[PDB]
Amino acid sequence: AVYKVKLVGPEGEEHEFDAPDDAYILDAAETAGVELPYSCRAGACSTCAGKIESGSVDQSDGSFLDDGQQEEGYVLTCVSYPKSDCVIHTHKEGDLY
């Protein structure tokens, strides 16, 4: 399945694109010409942190966020598979200190 993902940046800018259910959101975003922050690309840091506003993802390949943070809606975009249409706020690394 191919879902629709909308990213909302720190300045209010928006990006909307197709995201295959078998591709990481970060990779789908790059295919769509969006430059997002990232570093390890392995789910082991907080650089690519984003926050789900709606929709759901599978970020089980990640291991940096604890259940609390995940409950609040934080997602590691570099290891997140979309499971439905999503609206995610990017550049949220600052929230994870």
Ligand code: FES
């Ligand atoms: S870039 Fe490090 S967890 Fe995503």
